[PDB]
Design a protein around this ligand. Structure first.
Ligand SMILES: CC[C@]1(O)CC[C@H]2[C@@H]3CCC4=CC(=O)CCC4=C3C=C[C@@]21CC
Length: 246
């Protein structure tokens, strides 16, 4: 299984937020630790993406673009998996040093968004998602959001996305109507990530705009992305690719 061998080999290790778990929880400190973790994760998502099979087939500009547009969804999806494996989805395992209990969901003022993320985490349990299905789904998620008017070289992208869908189907058939109900389940789960990412895009965008006054810090790399790429998505210029009607 050359494909799966590669996916495990390139999977990022643990990433820490650097949070002070000794301080009392507060809005500014929690959101500032999440933003720092987001910057750290982004660095890892780029190295991970660039090591994926066939990634260099994409035009150089298209490579960074798909990474910037899918960053949020990719973070949420992997965070949902970590929460599942580490705490059976009972809390949101953003990092070993930044685990959100219900009190933190509330103090971060991201309660409703955390509910949606924890629900996603529970679905890894309900559907009995295997670590290999998770790896394949997460790679495909990178190729699931594009400009309405297309990429610099859309044909290379369409071929790469087609191959990752086929690999997902393959890992399925290896042990299998059954396959079909399974492919249906996994594609529905992939789609469900998009609305969650859209809520988080709205939330981080609104926070960036008022960040001067709510004392929340945004590292340079993302503030760039949040003010330049995220608005393209929120204004409908860049849209997710759904398997099913929405
Ligand atoms: C105020 C936190 C916030 O801006 C809002 C939503 C946050 C997302 C939520 C999803 C996520 C999952 C992770 O495993 C790492 C960090 C991570 C974020 C960091 C900062 C963000 C996005 C850049």
């Amino acid at each position: 299984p050359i494909f799966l061998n590669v996916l495990e080999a390139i999977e990022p290790g643990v990433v820490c937020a650097g949070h002070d778990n000794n301080q009392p929880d507060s809005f500014a400190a929690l959101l500032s630790s999440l933003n720092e973790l987001g910057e750290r994760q982004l660095v890892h998502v780029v190295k991970w993406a660039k090591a994926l099979p066939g990634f260099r087939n994409l035009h150089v500009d298209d490579q960074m673009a798909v990474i910037q547009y899918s960053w949020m969804g990719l973070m949420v999806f992997a965070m949902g998996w970590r929460s599942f494996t580490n705490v059976n989805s009972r809390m949101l395992y953003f990092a070993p040093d930044l685990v959100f209990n219900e009190y933190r969901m509330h103090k971060s003022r991201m309660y409703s968004q955390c509910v949606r993320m924890r629900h996603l985490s529970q679905e890894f349990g309900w559907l009995q998602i295997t670590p290999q299905e998770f790896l394949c789904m997460k790679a495909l998620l990178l190729f699931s959001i594009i400009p309405v008017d297309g990429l610099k070289n859309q044909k290379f992208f369409d071929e790469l996305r087609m191959n990752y869908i086929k690999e997902l189907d393959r890992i399925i058939a290896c042990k299998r109507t059954s396959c079909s109900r399974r492919f249906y389940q996994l594609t529905k789960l992939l789609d469900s990530v998009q609305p969650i990412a859209r809520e988080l895009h709205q939330f981080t965008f609104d926070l960036l705009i008022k960040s001067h006054m709510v004392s929340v810090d945004f590292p340079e790399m993302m503030a760039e992305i949040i003010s330049v790429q995220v608005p393209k998505i929120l204004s409908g210029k860049v849209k997710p690719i759904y398997f099913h009607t929405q």
